[PDB]
Amino acid sequence: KGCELYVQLHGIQQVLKDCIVHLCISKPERPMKFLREHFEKLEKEENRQILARQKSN
């Protein structure tokens, strides 16, 4: 785990706990499509914070 640092830098630790919880609620018939859509929302957020930092100078 020379990747130890990347993981805390990106939250990651936390990100994957909230999937298990998201899945435990909905318990979908199709966890793989579910997680694609879940992470398609979190990719939308990821980008907002990106375009946002492309305004600070």
Added chain:
Amino acid sequence: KGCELYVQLHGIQQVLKDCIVHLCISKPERPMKFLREHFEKLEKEENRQILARQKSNS
């Protein structure tokens, strides 16, 4: 607390464990885009295995 079973039944632990490995190897700058793309490939498999069953179910 019966997501213990849900997780068991869908082998969710093994799946999550592989995500964190794929990130730790590739260490992307954008890990959400990465993971959406990741589960996009895993979904396709899942839909290949679903439509395999509707064929042979009858």
